[PDB]
Amino acid sequence: TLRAAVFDLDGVLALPAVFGVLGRTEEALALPRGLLNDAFQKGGPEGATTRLMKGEITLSQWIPLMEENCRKCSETAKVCLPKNFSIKEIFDKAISARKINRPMLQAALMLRKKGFTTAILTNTWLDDRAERDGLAQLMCELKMHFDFLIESCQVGMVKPEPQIYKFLLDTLKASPSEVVFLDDIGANLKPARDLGMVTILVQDTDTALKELEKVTGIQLLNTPAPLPTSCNPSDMSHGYVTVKPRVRLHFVELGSGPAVCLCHGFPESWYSWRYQIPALAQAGYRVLAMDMKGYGESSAPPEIEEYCMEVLCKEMVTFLDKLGLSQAVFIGHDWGGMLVWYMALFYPERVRAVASLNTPFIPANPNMSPLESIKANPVFDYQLYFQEPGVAEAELEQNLSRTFKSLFRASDESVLSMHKVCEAGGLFVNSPEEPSLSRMVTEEEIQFYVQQFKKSGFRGPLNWYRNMERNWKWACKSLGRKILIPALMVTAEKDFVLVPQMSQHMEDWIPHLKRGHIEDCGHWTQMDKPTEVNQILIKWLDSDAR
Amino acid sequence: TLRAAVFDLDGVLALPAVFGVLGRTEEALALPRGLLNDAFQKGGPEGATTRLMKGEITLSQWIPLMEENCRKCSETAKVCLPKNFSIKEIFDKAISARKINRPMLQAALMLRKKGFTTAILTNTWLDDRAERDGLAQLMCELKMHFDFLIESCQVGMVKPEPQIYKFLLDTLKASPSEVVFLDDIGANLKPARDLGMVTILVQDTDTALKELEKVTGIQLLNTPAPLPTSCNPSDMSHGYVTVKPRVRLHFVELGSGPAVCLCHGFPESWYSWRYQIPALAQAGYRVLAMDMKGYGESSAPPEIEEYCMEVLCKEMVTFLDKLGLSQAVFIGHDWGGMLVWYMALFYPERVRAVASLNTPFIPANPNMSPLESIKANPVFDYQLYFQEPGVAEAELEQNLSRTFKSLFRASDESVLSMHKVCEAGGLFVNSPEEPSLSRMVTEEEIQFYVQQFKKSGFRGPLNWYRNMERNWKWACKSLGRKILIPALMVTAEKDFVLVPQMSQHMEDWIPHLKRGHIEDCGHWTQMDKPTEVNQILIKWLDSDAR
Ligand SMILES: CS(=O)(=O)N1CCC(NC(=O)N[C@]23C[C@H]4C[C@H](C[C@H](C4)C2)C3)CC1
Ligand SMILES: CS(=O)(=O)N1CCC(NC(=O)N[C@]23C[C@H]4C[C@H](C[C@H](C4)C2)C3)CC1
């Protein structure tokens, strides 16, 4: 029967509670016990704190009224307050020490995932201090995980007034016996109980979660490590920049701080970075995730030569110019990773830092044609199949659902043999017509790619392979250079095409290269090991690109 | 006959030249004259500097080769180099001291405006130093004003090789006698002259501009103060955020740094901030210029109550949440300025700083209905005309060209009487059917607004006036508050509706309010006095919001 869960911010979603810091201050300053808590509630509903929680006055307006209540309290207590005493300093440190109670948020997320409506109901103030950004940042991180956020100062009502609980029930569109309410202050539970709601008194997190487990029948404690937050296409800010008359690039944008540009591979989308976008934004970066030329909502001209590296790199520079960005950190994967090494070799001033996932930097061989180096590697046989225009397109567009289900699989779930693709006459000749769904992706995630490739097709994406000779001549101009800006190479142990050993001589060209290695990871790195990728990127960004 | 003008970067568009700093270093370190310039050119076409300018090696790779050339030069000169000597320190300071030669750029802009094709042809390097952002920032500011930017290190050719001048002519699609070429190095002029191009040797800027004046027949020196750079709609990054199921907000974005949100008035567009967008981005800010709800590419629902202040403010907060911005500086004008005061009163944690142009903060009167305060002011008579749905829409949509030409006029060019609008039965009853074009706007600029209002109409925009009672009740909740975050009020001397005297008691509610005043400025502040507005905003942002 339970279908909604309500949490308080202070003392349940964020720790430690403000009241906890008032008691710690009394002890530290050798003040009479309870003195600061008495001044805090001085007057009850008529008092300064009630006016503050109702939104009648701001936090900066309340500070001198609280200072006064401390003096009036100390005169009756026959005590002398120190000359260092400042309500502002006490509150600045208390508000700043508060951090998200990770196990409580994890439990809220699990309940929402299992069908629950979740909400935060808190007694809070209008913060106009010079340090108010810390609070804004906290609320933003939390509000994306809950259906509703009800703040006292916005609705003009406070807990424990009975009107605020009636307002909650009408917002949730639920009966009181369908709601669980968690709060660390007993007085605030009193009216929730009178109405018939299930209440949990939060003293410690573990005991509170055990009570929540019993009452919901869902496992919350000792649960496996959850996947990172993935973003929703319809909730993203969508950007469109025209880089040249017939070419418009589409990107998705989130966050503030140094710009980080994400470049997907074949046959993918901006959506392939869904697990990295919210994490990098939360770490302090402005993320721009591209739909590369030939894909999704970006232009897809039919001409082969529109997809040679030289053209693709020039358009990326124009993209930064039109956005008004002098520099960006470039992070690529697969074909995108190849592009970012060439952005660092040809436009170092525009690249703050460079990172590639799976794709190594391979210098061009001036003594051997690229088509003969391709024939030397039997794993790269499929690249010869991709050369004839129309051939690979017809097979890949014949059944879009089959194409993405056959490709997006973990390394143990493989269903294709990359050698003798030309002999066999196709990539899916020895493959099932209806392949099983991989453990990496959901049906809905596969359907997103199917929708994007129904508009564009495979001509644009396949043309990235039809410029071997043009790319070879252009890359031969950089054989005397070294990459001397911050660089990161991330290898994937189980990528059977882009094997880790292909990157072993990279230190000859990038002397101060930083490395990362991911075990049991296949070709589709971002969605195969999302937490590992996020950890490696954030650690490197904070040190080499700040 | 002249139709193209080519400029060099070092020593002509940017001062001082690198070579000038080499001579100053020799003098400062008591080194033999010419020693540093000899090491710089050691080897000629075989030398390290030629390989650097051709893109064969990067700047960081050239530094130790130049250091070596300095030692080989000092051994023959029988001199001892100091133990402080560092080519890296010398070049870091030289590159950093270089600033745009404002009169030269102004002259280039004037020529382009008069039909010329303009270009930069420079011998430059691939800069991979830790300080390379200074150079990237410089090139970005310059490249937006020129048709082509040809850099030696990108084309593999250097000046004075004859092949680079032939490459220039084919890019410009022009005959040599149709081109003017400016350079500070005589040797680089030599091949331009052999081909038949008009050449100007730059020793000092003033003499160079006088030569350029004689040869083009256009006045460049002693010319009036130009208007700030205005942006082109088709070159902007266009953003779309869905804030609620039926409502999508459109914005234009440029720059990097702290976020600045621009909010236009009635009946305007994001385009009303065209002169402020490039200036604020150049000052170090990330500018987001909104199409407010009811206008342009933003949603325009027909319901009146979708345009009350409470709804408009909540959507602005959702806009920041979806973009991943904890805070933004809010700058409004007219109806937008009213909105930003309410964003600071109701959501201070999300507002880094607040500024209003023309619109004062007016607290609600709890003893008087807003419709009776409106009747007390005869200038606000037109607000009663706007109340009946359909009435003002039909008159304003009857002739879109007439509407924007009648409204967008300077204070001396006024063509409407705001009193007895209801008696007369319309805003344009005593107005000409074909009004003259104002000095503030071009025909093309008027046509941009006509195109935007052809899609949307005037229902949405007029609905912002049809919530007097709802806005009054909501604002009565803030009568106990004070605005205690950084605030700026900018008054316009000749605004006959929003008169400066309407803001005189603002210090009672915003004690530390900063003020700005613009003389001879009417209602349309941004486009009436663009340079003054930019100056006032940038000075305030750099001090109160950094
Ligand atoms: C030029 S490169 O060596 O940097 N190059 C190699 C091939 C790579 N991409 C690639 O071919 N990946 C796929 C990904 C799956 C699996 C297999 C076949 C098909 C679908 C293409 C390899 C891009 C970069
Ligand atoms: C509620 S307020 O006092 O902040 N309010 C007053 C009116 C103002 N805007 C306004 O009415 N401006 C116009 C601009 C031109 C000139 C005249 C008539 C018409 C076209 C509207 C005033 C918006 C803010």
Residue numbers in the entry:
A (entry chain A), B (entry chain A): 2 to 547
How does the study describe this entry?
The human protein is 62.5 kDa in size and consists of a C-terminal and an N-terminal domain connected by a short proline-rich linker. The C-terminal domain exhibits hydro­lase activity and the N-terminal domain is suggested to have phosphatase activity.
The large, potent ligands (compounds 1–4) have distinct chemical features, such as the adamatyl moiety of compounds 1 and 2, and the tetrahedral sulfur atoms of compounds 2 and 3 which are readily recognizable and could be unambiguously modelled in the electron-density maps. Interestingly, the fraction of indexed images varies between 6 and 69%, with compound 2 being the outlier on the low side.
